[PDB]
Design brief:
part of a larger assembly, 4 chains, A: 25 residues, little secondary structure, 0% helix, B: 570 residues, alpha/beta, 4-stranded parallel sheet, 25 helices, binds phosphothiophosphoric acid-adenylate ester, binds magnesium ion, ATP binding (chain D), chaperone (chain D), peptidase activity (chain D), ATP-dependent Clp protease ATP-binding subunit ClpA (chain D)
């Protein structure tokens, strides 16, 4: 027959961001 | 926040610029133009680009530039102070307009903002990127300085500031220019360090920097190497406060930081007995040991390609010839770390990411390349690539690059140096042999042709890059006797830890060698025969017998029964 | 490997006196990133505290600050807007060279 | 308003480069604006500032008008994605400001918002999709071709919304009117005189030598720069004289090529190719003469175009001056030379292609096919007949101005009583290939005297290297013969002679420097005795 070619599945990292407050006075 | 370069030139604080005449004319040429009036200096770290920007200002006072440029004045942007000098918002914008108003009033004047890349990509940074092109409108001139890596990211994407700006290529200064340029800053260091530098001392620095510290550009590195040399005299000699230092200390600092000429006695015996030291450990491979040592000696002497590695070797042979053993032992004798890699794992095209790192932003990007990080950590290393044939052809492309220039860039972009790495690879292209001998009353040596398999598996260009392809021959009967002795010594060391001493008669060693000697299998069966005959009885005695406490064992062979006799005394 | 022992150890050698005369009198310090962040609730507290320590080093001209884990200051406390990281505040002083700070970090 | 520029209102007084021509190209630009739906004019192609010139040019047209009164009244805007992508230090800030722009931008439903390098966003790109389908704001986005194809075509909300306006590269003759329209404007820009005929002589390098800068982009920065350099170079002397010579200095340093090449040396270079080729590579007088005759016909380009520019076929063992000419052949020409051995590159990854983006930027690529002699010949048949190379776009091959140098090593590999070299080529090659072949050159035998000179080349590199160390190597001519006797093998030609000096001679010499008789020596008594026909090594201080 013919050769069998496999395909990979790239996975990209994803992140979120938190926030820090600071009272003016 | 700002400085007047014209006043600084009169004061003399800034160092007079030396050389770079070609770069200055190109910069002034684009600067004079009505459009593309914002010159950009693209140069690596420490090349000299920043000095060129200030050198032009000093030249204005001299008057060698065109008369129209005399009106122009240069101002430095104190990006650091401006960021700190803010309380709520808008501080940068108000002050920048007033400065630019003077520039707009006097179109001749220029505004040299150092590290222009920083401006583009907290609150003030957002405004600062837009303030440059919109308010300037392309009429007000501005000088910039950004490296090749930063220039691609910062300027290529926007394309608005890039069109207004006009790059000016930069190149490393010549060796002659380097000594001239360093002379300007040499008086400063001698005064603070209270040392004197001879003309020969500065001559050695440039040559040593390129050969040992080629990673870092020669001009800035030249300044750094001579700075450390001055400090050495101040602190290294505890007594006599010795000034009047020469090349000898210069070699002492450049070579030490880089981690050498004038081979010492220790270094001499390291390479002088490298071949004889490796013959004792590995027998029957004198042709292979001499070839490997000779290439390594060529690199130390320096009769070899500078960019290429010290040596590239491919060990192809039958099983049990100690091809990999000579590699491991070479590292031990040389005292160089053995970066042992197995290419069986790297048999897929996707696995290349483990070698040069994963793509940026991936879950495994933090790990990085396994080959680039390892070589960087240990610049002097022995890169043993076992079973290269098993790996996918994609890795061979990477290896071709290392052989040609001894460099490899990962996703991060770090540059590695393989000049000091003795690349070594092993393959099993010809292990397969014709088990069927001559079909006749007497046998014949119909062994398969040697090196024919290597040619088919490996492409011709790859073979050419390799310094030499050393074929390992089958071990001789005499060689097997020597192999048994080293294995017996290893057994004695293990027994010594348990308090047991073993004495093996010379006759017994010959019997074991004959029983376990197989040409095709190699030297590995000898360990198996030793394990079956010596280790197995001793282990039973060591656990359930007299040897538990510790004893003396003597092994002999009975001629009538042709079997080994073991005597335990304890 | 021993990088921390080499920095802290330098202090021990100095008191013993088996060091060069130039470095015989150097008041080594050990910056604590966590300690600064403890009282940074109010705006501008980080700049005030960080600037105060930096001023002490330059006026002395002999004080040396050993800051382990220098990677941490790359992304130090920045609530919002100002983005005044510790690295940004210390970047100009290091360029001049008035203050010298030892660092220790892993290869990764 | 921070990122808004009024191109139409700003151009009322002036200040925009008028790009004469492209009148028929701009008809579509106006035809899109008159559409009830899907009226999003998009300009696709690739260039640097030139690509946006179609958009910047359209700004002038809106001012000039001369279109339907309803369509005539309008306005265009432009925003820089980069300006809002710098200093954000977070993801999603750019999109937030993009939506906030509507608070002031939404004044009328007839206007356009130009975008630059929109490929970077597709930089979240989520909010871009709904704003498109709304249609309340028109969009003109400049971007490249290859990247744009991968993302925009696969989408639905983007491809249908826009009206693709393809752009093409002007021909050699068409390029004359590219600068003719801008010649008066450039005269006013610098207020200096320029030679009219000089513009036609500025396309020598732009057409094929660089292949990295487009023709409009090259013209804008080469004529203006030449006038500027000539005007500003003499500070004391005021001169407005410009010519081809001035253009050579500007092109020479940026293109890193000899000044003579930029001049009108096409006739001189052809005549000088013969002697120049002889200078680089020593020997091969017969082969070089036939070689330059083929190259003479190849540069003509006044004959059958379908046939390849040339098919140089050699028949010589490896290392006998065949693979050496490869370096000298390209070095004299100055073009980059490819090395893709057919045997080594017969994989499915590359054989089907007949190594994805590099091949396009190769005006004259001398492809090397080593070991071709040992279905490879059939593959080359289509190349000669139709000059077609498979690729993503499927355009014709570049063999009109590209040559393929295939080398054969079958004259001696077949046998060693053996037949002549010309017998193996007949049987191994295909009948069609042999007949269509322009000519056959032979490197089977290398002159005896020439071999000695090549050996001296490597010895000189070793000798000069040793002189730096502080020692002098004296390789007597008698010893040199030994270097070529063992190195030369009829089966494998003289290929082992290349490295026969880095192993047989460079190995003992190095040992002496590290540890031996004298770390620093010289006066090597090289000689060959007749006891065993071997070299001698001795020296003293
Ligand atoms: N062409 C030159 N002529 C004279 N002095 C020079 C020249 N180039 C560099 N120097 C001196 O060397 C110093 C250091 O080099 P710079 O050009 O300032 O470094 P740089 O290119 O800005 O690199 P950094 O510091 O890594 S951002 C300058 O400040 C001058 O004192
Ligand atoms: N020529 C030799 N001299 C001394 N010991 C040897 C020799 N050949 C093999 N040995 C020993 O046998 C083992 C060889 O292990 P390796 O070095 O991995 O062999 P190898 O020849 O690389 O194996 P292959 O061919 O890859 S299956 C070690 O225990 C060596 O000490
Ligand atoms: N050369 C040395 N002399 C004396 N004690 C040492 C030496 N090297 C290591 N040690 C001791 O062993 C410890 C090893 O951990 P550290 O050196 O503190 O770690 P590090 O090298 O800073 O690495 P991390 O990753 O930051 S924990 C030291 O803290 C000492 O207690
Ligand atoms: Mg092995
Ligand atoms: Mg630690």
């Amino acid at each position: 027959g013919k050769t069998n070619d496999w395909l990979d599945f790239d996975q990209l990292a994803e992140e979120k961001v938190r926030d820090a407050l600071k009272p003016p006075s | 926040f700002t400085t007047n370069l014209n006043q600084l030139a009169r004061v003399g604080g800034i160092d007079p610029l030396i050389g770079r005449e070609k770069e200055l004319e190109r910069a002034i040429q684009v600067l004079c133009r009505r459009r593309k009036n914002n010159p950009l200096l693209v140069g690596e770290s420490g090349v000299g680009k920043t000095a060129i920007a200030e050198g032009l200002a000093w030249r204005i006072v001299q008057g060698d530039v065109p008369e129209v440029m005399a009106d122009c004045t240069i101002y430095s942007l104190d990006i650091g102070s401006l960021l700190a000098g803010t309380k709520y918002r808008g501080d940068f914008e108000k002050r920048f307009k007033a400065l630019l108003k003077q520039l707009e009033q006097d179109t001749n004047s220029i505004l040299f903002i150092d590290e222009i890349h920083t401006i583009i990509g907290g609150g003030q940074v957002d405004a600062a990127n837009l303030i440059k092109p919109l308010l300037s409108s392309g009429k007000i001139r501005v000088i910039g300085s950004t490296t090749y890596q930063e220039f691609s990211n910062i300027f290529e994407k926007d394309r608005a500031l890039a069109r207004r700006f006009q790059k000016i290529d930069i190149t490393e200064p010549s060796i002659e220019e380097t000594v001239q340029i360093i002379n300007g800053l040499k008086p400063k260091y001698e005064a603070h360090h209270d040392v004197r530098y001879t003309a020969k001392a500065v001559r050695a620095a440039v040559e040593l920097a390129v050969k040992y510290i080629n990673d870092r550009h020669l001009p800035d590195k030249a300044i750094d190497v001579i700075d450390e040399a001055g400090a050495r005299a101040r602190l290294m000699p505890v007594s006599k406060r010795k000034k009047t230092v020469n090349v000898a200390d210069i070699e002492s600092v450049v070579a030490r930081i880089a981690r050498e000429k004038s081979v010492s006695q220790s270094d001499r015996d390291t390479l002088k007995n490298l071949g004889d030291r490796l013959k004792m450990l590995v027998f029957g491979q004198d042709k292979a040991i001499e070839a490997l040592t000779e290439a390594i000696k060529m690199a130390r002497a320096g009769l070899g390609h500078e960019h290429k590695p010290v040596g590239s070797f491919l060990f192809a042979g039958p099983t049990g010839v100690g091809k990999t053993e000579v590699t491991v032992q070479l590292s031990k004798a040389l005292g160089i770390e053995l970066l042992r890699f197995d290419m069986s794992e790297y048999m897929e095209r996707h696995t290349v990411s483990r070698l040069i790192g994963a793509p940026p932003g991936y879950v495994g990007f933090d790990q990085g390349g396994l080959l680039t990080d390892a070589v960087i950590k240990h610049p002097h290393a022995v890169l043993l690539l076992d079973e290269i044939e098993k790996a996918h052809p994609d890795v061979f492309n990477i290896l071709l690059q290392v052989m040609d220039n001894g460099t490899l860039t990962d996703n991060n972009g770090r540059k590695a140096d393989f000049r000091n790495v003795v690349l070594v690879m092993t393959t099993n292209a010809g292990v397969r042999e014709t088990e069927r001998k001559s079909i006749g009353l007497i046998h014949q040596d119909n062994s398969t042709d040697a090196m024919e398999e290597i040619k088919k598996i490996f492409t011709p260009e790859f073979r050419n890059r390799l310094d030499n392809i050393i074929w390992f021959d089958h071990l001789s009967t005499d060689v097997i006797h020597q192999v048994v002795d080293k294995f017996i010594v290893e057994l004695q060391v293990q027994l010594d830890q348990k308090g047991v001493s073993l004495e093996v008669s010379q006759e017994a060693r010959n019997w074991l060698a004959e029983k376990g000697y197989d040409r095709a299998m190699g030297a590995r069966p000898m360990a198996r025969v030793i394990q079956d005959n010596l280790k197995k009885p001793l282990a039973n005695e060591l656990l359930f017998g007299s040897l538990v406490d510790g004893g003396q064992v003597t092994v002999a062979l009975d001629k009538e029964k042709n079997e080994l006799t073991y005597g335990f005394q304890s | 490997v021993g990088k921390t022992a080499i920095a802290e150890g330098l202090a021990w050698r100095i008191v013993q006196g088996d060091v060069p005369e130039v470095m015989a009198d150097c008041t080594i310090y050990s910056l604590d990133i966590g300690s600064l962040l403890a009282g940074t609730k109010y705006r501008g507290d980080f700049e005030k505290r960080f600037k105060a320590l930096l001023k002490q080093l330059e006026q002395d001209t002999n004080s040396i600050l050993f800051i382990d884990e220098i990677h941490t200051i790359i992304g130090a406390g920045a609530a919002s807007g100002g983005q005044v990281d510790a690295a940004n505040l210390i970047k100009p002083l290091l360029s001049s060279g008035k203050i010298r700070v030892i660092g220790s970090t892993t290869y990764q």
